[PDB]
Write a structure and sequence with these properties.
This is PRKCA-binding protein. It contains three helices and seven strands; from the N terminus they run E-E-E-H-E-E-H-E-H-E. The chain has 112 residues and is an alpha+beta fold. It has a single domain, classed as PDZ domain (Pdz3 Domain, Roll). Strands 1, 2, 3, 4, 5, 6 and 7 form a seven-stranded antiparallel β-sheet that branches. The longest helix has 10 residues.
Length: 112
């Protein structure tokens, strides 16, 4: 998994249920990084079109999330009202292969 990345960010509105429409997490094994595991249809994240499964989530509203659990990051995002800025690394690989990869067994994730 030697894949180059580029930093980016997107500001997404919360939907009526306080969702942006992504799952964040990764494998069961230790990883110091956190990944978008799923983008759900018809949610702010999907309609915006910027983020995708396999992208690394790196921060929230100008704060790095490094060293935090996926539950802590989710809690952080859930507590931001109306509008949230998601910081990410785009992985420079076949997007469909990234989707499949993070579709795999043993992937743990929190929907927000």
């Amino acid at each position: 998994l030697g894949i180059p990345t580029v930093p980016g960010k997107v500001t997404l509105q919360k939907d009526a249920q306080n969702l942006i429409g992504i799952s964040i997490g990764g494998g069961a094994q230790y990883c110091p990084c956190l990944y978008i595991v799923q983008v759900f249809d018809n949610t702010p994240a999907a309609l915006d079109g910027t983020v995708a499964a396999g992208d690394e989530i790196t921060g929230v509203n100008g704060r790095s999330i490094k060293g935090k659990t996926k539950v802590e990051v989710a809690k952080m995002i859930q507590e931001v009202k109306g509008e949230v800025t998601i910081h990410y690394n785009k992985l420079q690989a076949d997007p469909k292969q990234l989707e499949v990869l993070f579709n795999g067994p043993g992937i743990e994730s929190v929907k927000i």
